[PDB]
């Protein structure tokens, strides 16, 4: 019928037994001490992230899963740059919820564990799974807050997690289904359901050609799938003339590499080469659901990178919207090409800040893996705001260098103004970022390379195996704090 | 006979002509305005790093090379994390000196350019070249300060640069000449010439075996070249009982990869796989020449990594000095093996701080290239001291993450306590650093991965093509500031 997830902390030295949360101690009382008695009989105490299931304790809750929360007073961890307490909660709740799902129970009530937003994030992120195309599926579990106190915190958590889950769905979906047009239509419907203060323009190829986006066009032409330039507006500020914050996302729905073709091994993961677009767009949908009082513009060039009789050829020279020429030495370095045009266009909105996200380089994954998103920025103020936000969400960011040293390696070019791959193979993520800087004149610009946090195997406990949707929540948190 | 290098700044808006330095304006006066007149006739003004040669202006200086210094008031660059003025000076002076050398002039007098230490660094770093083994060599140039004002600043610069040049020589020298024993003997003689307050112990294999350094021994055994553990003491503090700062360096004189053999292409560069040892040792020699009032200990395990009938075999399990077991899954991840033992030993000196340097991973080069040295540390205080020092020297450092997320990938091990390569190929430099942390219990430890700054092609203007010796000067500066 209905399941229940309860938390218990690790025992502190001067305590006689590990302490339950408020909901845990109360439940124990409701069942006349039966919960504590059975936990004692079952064996060793529960450590952070571990779970244990007890049956028949109450007629309304035939299955009760107790989860280990770790140390009660865990706050900000200086070594890890995150709030440890929140991370323990998200992981423990996800584990509890999955045990309830394995038991095939359709609904679960969750202990707020001293921080309802984090508990909600663990349940919602933890239970997610993309199974639309399978006949064999797990039971759909409805998770709700146990109790009626602090409902707003719980709901804030569901909102944040739902935002990241949308990014995951968009990324996980096979490319033949998640085409440039389909992605745009899904985002449009999600933003419009979130708020009536929105405008969406799924700009077609003719518009792209009118905007002189020759760099973006050179990439798209190799494929038979039509390209689109997604532009979204969220008018949340009281003053309509208030300059917007602009977000830009790389939307390659599928990257085969083009003529500079990729190796077969694990190339299926390239259906998520639109993760940049998925994360910034989901962040705008959430900000819109939250009705944040700020104006926001989202831009996402979308297309496929395929080999054919009309594809980009190594050595070809293309002209960006701003007139700069680019020598396309490697057709698989296509993200920086489409972003050159999107970033130029971003300046037309005379924005307050410009933030782009992209699953850009294999070098970023080699650099930091899934530990943190790499952030390249010309503004320490901006770096600090993103960093602070990440400490709260736990979806970490780490700063990478924007030095002229790297710019030199991309402007040293045989045929044009700038080369799309550096002279050397060293510092791939840094030279890619340097390339993007040639298309930015704004004082507050940040580039997020999310190639390393594209997927999850088991690094983040509360995310099942698959596309991660990172760092959506950090983006939402940043916008939230910015609006205040 | 004698050459002269003079600097000129870029013209500021309200100036009528670009301004010479004090020495430049004075020289012009000595030759009755002849220098300004010829510079005007020659054409365009000189920009940062550019040079122009003028002949017969003075009987004592038949060749005068004027160098562009860029903007006079260039101070700390917030984008680049360095003092721009100093960088302009080092590069301009190096260029001037090389033009004098191409002219085959044996001696040059150098303009202090408003910062004699930086001018000296440019001349000394700029003229260096390892040519001991060649019949064809360039003329040996003696560079001296032009004038007698601020001689201490000039000499400080020669000292710092000479320290980095020694590291370059040690790294550049072919491995058949730069063996573990030879390296130790060269370092010993350099430290002893620098100060009488020193003790050096070139510990032999029997000592290594007594110290139970099974991890370090497993690497060395594959080669016929005897291993040595270099231990150096600099007793500069007034109080002999004052706890020392300990430096540790990876000293692989040649890395073939062992049974997990490297590819042939550019493997010759592996003669510099002892760069970690070269930099920390040269830094201690310089600190000793400077008679810094601090106690310092330097530790450097040295050996070759070769394939043979007795070499490390993939899957073998070895025991570190501290008793932890290590599964050697890849024999080419040998630096972390030798460092495990050296870091354990470092704790026996009950140090104030522990700093190790190593040309450790190819992943670090992929991460940041030669832009900056990667620093992994459990102390933000320590990170800040190294960072501040680097701003002054221009030999930059950039912080990398020490997260438990990476530790998990090395302790997940089939046969032993820790695995010498991670479960995944992502974040190579971070997992290597995590591996090292398992052998450190100190509160102030910093790991410097210098694999990306091992060589110079043309990135650093004042260093000719070859082994760079980075980041020696940043290490010296750190020690200098620490002693004050
Ligand atoms: C590893 C990937 C993120 C590579 C990236 N798709 C590049 O455009 O090919
Ligand atoms: C690129 C190199 C620094 C690799 C390093 N010598 C490892 O032990 O093989
Ligand atoms: Zn997809
Ligand atoms: Zn690509
Ligand atoms: Zn791509
Ligand atoms: Zn050498
Ligand atoms: Zn190796
Ligand atoms: Zn090595």
Swiss-Prot record, chains A, B:
Q: How does it assemble?
A: Homohexamer.
Which CDD domains does this UniProt record tie to the protein?
Peptidase_M17 (cd00433)
As recorded in Swiss-Prot or TrEMBL, the protein's gene is named LAP3
Please tell me whether the keyword Hydrolase is annotated for this protein. Answer: yes
Disulfide bonds, paired cysteine numbers = none
Task: Family membership, please give it.
Answer: Belongs to the peptidase M17 family.
**Binding locations of Zn(2+) 2:** 250, 255, 273, 334
A GO CC annotation recorded here is: mitochondrion
Functional note: Cytosolic metallopeptidase that catalyzes the removal of unsubstituted N-terminal hydrophobic amino acids from various peptides. The presence of Zn(2+) ions is essential for the peptidase activity, and the association with other cofactors can modulate the substrate spectificity of the enzyme. For instance, in the presence of Mn(2+), it displays a specific Cys-Gly hydrolyzing activity of Cys-Gly-S-conjugates. Involved in the metabolism of glutathione and in the degradation of glutathione S-conjugates, which may play a role in the control of the cell redox status.
Protein name in UniProt: Cytosol aminopeptidase
Q: Which residues carry this modification: N6-succinyllysine?
A: 13, 29, 71, 423, 444, 457
Give cofactor(s), names only.
Zn(2+); Mn(2+)
- Enumerate the subcellular locations listed in this protein's record, separating them with semicolons: Cytoplasm
Please tell me where Mg(2+) binds in this chain. Answer: 255, 332, 334
The activity regulation comment is: Zofenoprilat inhibits Cys-Gly hydrolysis activity.
Task: Tell me the organism.
Answer: Bos taurus (Bovine)
Annotated Zn(2+) 3 binding sites: 170-171, 173, 271
């Amino acid at each position: 019928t209905k399941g229940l997830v309860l938390g218990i902390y690790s025992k502190e030295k001067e305590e006689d037994e590990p302490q339950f949360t408020s909901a845990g101690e109360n439940f124990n009382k409701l069942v006349s001490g039966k919960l504590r008695e059975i936990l004692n009989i079952s064996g060793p105490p529960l450590k952070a992230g571990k779970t244990r299931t007890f049956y028949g304790l109450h007629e309304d809750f035939p299955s009760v899963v107790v989860v280990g929360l770790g140390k009660k007073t865990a706050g900000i961890d200086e070594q890890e740059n995150w709030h440890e307490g929140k991370e323990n909660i998200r992981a423990a709740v996800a584990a509890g919820c999955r045990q309830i799902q394995d038991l095939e129970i359709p609904s679960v009530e969750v202990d707020p564990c001293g921080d309802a937003q984090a508990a909600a994030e663990g349940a919602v992120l933890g239970l997610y799974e993309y199974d639309d195309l399978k006949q064999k599926r797990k039971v759909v579990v409805s998770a709700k807050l146990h109790g009626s106190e602090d409902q707003e915190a719980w709901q804030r958590g569901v909102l944040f997690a739902s935002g990241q889950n949308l990014a995951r769905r968009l990324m996980e979906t096979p490319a033949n289904e998640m085409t440039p047009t389909k992605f745009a239509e899904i985002v449009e419907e999600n933003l419009k359901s979130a708020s009536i203060k929105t405008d969406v323009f799924i700009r077609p190829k003719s518009w792209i050609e009118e905007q002189e986006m020759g760099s973006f066009l050179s990439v798209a032409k190799g494929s038979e799938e039509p390209p689109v330039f997604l532009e979204i507006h969220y008018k949340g500020s009281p003053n309509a003339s208030e300059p917007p914050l602009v977000f830009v996302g790389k939307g390659i729905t599928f990257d085969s590499g083009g003529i500079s073709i990729k190796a077969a091994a694990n190339m299926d993961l390239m259906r998520a080469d639109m993760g940049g677009a998925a994360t910034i767009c989901s962040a705008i949908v959430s900000a819109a659901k939250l009705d944040l009082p700020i104006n926001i513009v989202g831009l996402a060039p979308l297309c496929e990178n395929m080999p054919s009789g009309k594809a980009n050829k190594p050595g070809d020279v293309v002209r960006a919207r701003n007139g700069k020429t680019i020598q396309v030495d490697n057709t698989d370095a296509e993200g920086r090409l489409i972003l050159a045009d999107a970033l130029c266009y971003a300046h037309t909105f005379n924005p307050k800040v410009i933030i782009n996200a992209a699953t850009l380089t294999g070098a970023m994954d080699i650099a930091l893996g899934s530990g943190a998103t790499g952030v390249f920025t010309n503004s320490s103020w901006l770096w600090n705001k993103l960093f602070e936000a990440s400490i709260e969400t736990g979806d970490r960011v780490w700063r990478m260098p924007l030095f002229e040293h790297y710019t030199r390696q991309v402007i040293d070019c045989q045929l044009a103004d700038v080369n799309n791959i550096g002279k050397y193979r060293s510092a791939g993520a840094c030279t890619a970022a340097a390339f993007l800087k040639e298309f930015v004149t704004h004082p507050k610009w940040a580039h997020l390379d999310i190639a390393g946090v594209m997927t999850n195997k088991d690094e983040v406990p509360y995310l099942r195996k698959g596309m991660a949707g990172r760092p959506t929540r950090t983006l939402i948190e940043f916008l939230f704090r910015f609006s205040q």
